[PDB]
Design a protein around this ligand. Structure first.
Ligand SMILES: COc1ccc(N=O)c(O)c1
Lengths: 237, 300
């Protein structure tokens, strides 16, 4: 059933699984029309499909042309997500296909279940967990490839860089959620923390800076401080 | 007018005949039911006074044979049987009428209720849902499960209603996933009506039979089937106009007949609120919406 507070180390076992987050598929800016009405303009979006064990990220870029002449776009976006995830699964060799797909928003369940009818053995699961994947577009390299796209495109990343050489998946995911939780609560301060030290750089083939083990502990502690800070600034504590 | 005689009534029992019912006491001199209208299927049903567990009964059509009821003290139930000897049977019946040992099917002449509940119900279709080919009548009870219920266990005692499942390859055309899930017209009109039922009359017949088994026996799988068949129509944007008007009449009489005190268990809040207020046909069921709002405004 639902992945919750009681059954999450299952993320790091050896059954292939994918998280699917659709919160950046349909993106718009709201603006005023010359007549003083309100209108939206879509911008490029992305499906965030992630193997939490390996770090492999299947970033399907959603180009604004997919919305042209369509109605009820927020509803369509869930079905387009499910169509693309199904297409991804079918494109993978059998031994790479997931056993489970966990959707971060419950409104994706029926669209994904219907698109995956051909895969009765792939379990489609919700999660009570509140995962920060909406903040993926705060990662500069992911935002850049989404906005630059001129057509539909799939781009593959490892969201853990080389961390798995040194830490377990459990810890890597832990770090990713903390980074994303920080970028989601105060993007400016989070990015400040990550790049404050110009001697630590992001490798061309990486998403995050090349922190030593010790520097990651410092960074991680600064991110927790930031999250707690914003929690106090928000609720006044 | 036809007659279903009873050999005897050795155990106290509430007997139903269609939407009517009466109490018979242990060893009361009861010998059956006369004046049964020809032209309709009928159901004769039972609930024992000492164990209300298992409502059970028999669907039958008096045009298909001479049927009677006889208590079996080994299996502990009133059983329907067919008498092939026509003169033996007329003989039995005539004697019991002369002694006035029979209740009269108590039909008010103004009243079209039973016709309206069974308009599309055919014995031949009942016998395909309830499989027991050596008998011309069909036994149903409270506990019998449906083919669909069994998929999710004795196949000979099952209700073989047409399986309807909105998240199934049958319901969903490859490449029309969103369209077909949000608008079930393909599944209703091509798969079910053209393909399986052949026509709307057979569809309505199974819908009506499912309702009657839900109401008369508390059969839960029947209630599920009734609601699925309603939902499939209401969730279709394209429905022949004659079907929508007939569906409104069908549902109106079903809601009108339902006991006021069983609405908590026989009516699915989600389906009805969705059908009357959210679905494509939200504005097409005027009579049903009116009786539902006046009789069961709580459910809504
Ligand atoms: C190490 O696994 C997890 C799983 C879920 C989380 N939050 O919802 C988390 O931060 C870590």
């Amino acid at each position: 059933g639902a992945m919750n507070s009681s059954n999450y180390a299952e993320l790091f076992n050896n059954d292939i699984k994918l998280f699917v987050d659709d919160t950046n598929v349909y993106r718009v800016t709201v603006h005023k029309t010359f007549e003083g009405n309100v209108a939206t303009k879509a911008i490029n979006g992305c499906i965030f499909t992630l193997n939490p064990k390996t770090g492999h990220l299947f970033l399907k870029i959603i180009h604004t042309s997919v919305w042209a002449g369509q109605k009820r776009l927020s509803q369509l976006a869930k079905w387009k997500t499910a169509e693309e995830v199904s297409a991804l699964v079918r494109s993978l060799p059998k031994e790479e296909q997931p056993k489970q797909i966990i959707v971060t928003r419950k409104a994706m369940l029926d669209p994904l279940e219907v698109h995956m009818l051909d895969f009765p053995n792939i379990a489609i699961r919700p999660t009570e967990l509140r995962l920060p994947f909406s903040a993926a577009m705060s990662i500069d390299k992911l935002s850049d490839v989404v906005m630059k796209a001129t057509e539909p495109q799939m781009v593959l990343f490892n969201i853990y860089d080389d961390w798995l050489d040194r830490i377990s998946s459990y810890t890597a995911f832990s770090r990713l959620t903390l980074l994303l939780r920080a970028l989601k609560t105060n993007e400016e301060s989070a990015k400040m923390i990550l790049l404050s030290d110009p001697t630590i750089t992001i490798k061309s083939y990486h998403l995050w800076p090349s922190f030593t083990d010790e520097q990651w502990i410092t960074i991680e502690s600064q991110m927790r401080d930031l999250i707690l800070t914003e929690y106090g600034r928000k609720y006044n504590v | 007018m036809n007659t279903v005689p009873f050999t005897s009534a050795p155990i106290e029992v509430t007997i139903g005949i269609d939407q009517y019912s009466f109490n018979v006491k242990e060893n009361q001199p009861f010998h059956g039911i006369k004046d049964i209208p020809i032209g309709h299927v009928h159901v004769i049903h039972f609930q024992h006074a000492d164990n209300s567990s298992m409502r059970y009964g028999y669907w039958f059509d008096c045009r298909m044979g001479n049927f009677y009821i006889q208590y079996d003290p080994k299996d502990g139930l009133y059983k329907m049987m067919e008498e092939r000897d026509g003169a033996k049977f007329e003989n039995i019946v005539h004697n019991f009428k002369e002694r006035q040992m029979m209740v009269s099917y108590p039909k008010i002449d103004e009243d079209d209720t039973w016709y309206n509940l069974t308009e599309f119900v055919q014995m031949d279709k009942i016998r395909k849902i309830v499989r027991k080919d050596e008998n011309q009548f069909s036994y149903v009870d409270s506990s019998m499960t449906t083919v669909q219920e069994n998929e999710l266990s004795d196949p000979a005692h099952s209700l073989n209603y047409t399986v309807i499942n909105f998240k199934s390859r049958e319901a969903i055309r490859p490449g029309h996933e969103m369209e077909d899930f949000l608008d079930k017209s393909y599944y209703l009109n091509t798969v079910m009506l053209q393909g399986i039922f052949k026509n709307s009359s057979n569809y309505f017949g199974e819908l009506q039979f499912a309702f009657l088994n839900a109401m008369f026996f508390g059969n839960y799988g029947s209630s599920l089937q009734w609601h699925a068949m309603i939902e499939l129509i209401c969730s279709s944007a394209t429905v022949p106009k004659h079907m929508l008007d007939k569906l409104d009449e069908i549902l109106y009489y079903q809601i009108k007949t339902l006991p006021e005190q069983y609405s908590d268990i026989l009516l699915n809040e989600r389906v009805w609120n969705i059908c009357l207020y959210s679905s494509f046909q939200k504005n097409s069921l005027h009579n049903t919406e009116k009786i539902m709002e006046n009789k069961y405004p709580e459910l809504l």
